[PDB]
Design a binder for this molecule. Structure first.
Ligand code: EMC
Ligand code: EMC
Ligand SMILES: [Cl-]
Ligand SMILES: [Mg+2]
Lengths: 93, 92
C-alpha cells in the first residue's frame, strides 16, 4: 500500500529551505507534501483539523507518554487520549 | 494582512501539557485554539490548508528572513513569497 500518514507528515515537517532553488518552488513542494499527509480529496474539514490537533498534542506530551501514544499510531485526538486514559483507569481500579 | 492570526497560531503552538489538568482537557483546549486560528466557520478546506503550508514555510526560513516575513503578516504562501521577492529586489 501507500506510505503510512506519519511518513507523509514527517516529510512535510522535515523539508528544508535549501532543498529547493527558491521560495516559490519551496512553497509549491510544501503544498504537495501537505496534500499527501492531510488528504483533502478524502478527508472533510473536520477530519483535517483533527489531524492538525493530534500532531500538536503528540508534540507536547511528556517523553514517556509521547512514545507510548506514538506506538499506538493514533488517527485522531480521541484515540490518543483514550490510550492514556486506559493506563489511568487500570491504575485507579 | 491582519496581525491577529499569528497571535492565535502562536497560542495554539505554545500551549503546554501542564496547562491542563490532564490529556482529555489538553486535547479539548487544543481543538479550541486550533479553531481560533484556522477559523473553519469562515475558511474553506483549501484556505485552511494554505494556512498550514504558510506556517511551515515561515518555520523553515532562516532567522532574519523569518522575522522579516513574519512582520509583514502574509495571509497565505503566495503572499509570503512576494514578501521575499520584494525584499530581494530592494537589496539588489
Ligand atoms: C478538531 C480540531 Hg481544530
Ligand atoms: C494548500 C495545499 Hg496542503
Ligand atoms: Cl472531550
Ligand atoms: Mg483526568
Amino acid at each position: 500500500g501507500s506510505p503510512d500518514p506519519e511518513i507523509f507528515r514527517q516529510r512535510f515537517r522535515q523539508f528544508g529551505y535549501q532543498d529547493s532553488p527558491g521560495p516559490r518552488e519551496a512553497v509549491s513542494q510544501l503544498r504537495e507534501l501537505c496534500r499527501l499527509w492531510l488528504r483533502p480529496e478524502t478527508h472533510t474539514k473536520e477530519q483535517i483539523l483533527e489531524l492538525v490537533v493530534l500532531e500538536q498534542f503528540v508534540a507536547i506530551l511528556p517523553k514517556e507518554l509521547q512514545t507510548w501514544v506514538r506506538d499506538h499510531h493514533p488517527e485522531n485526538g480521541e484515540e490518543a487520549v483514550t490510550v492514556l486514559e486506559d493506563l489511568e483507569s487500570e491504575l485507579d481500579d
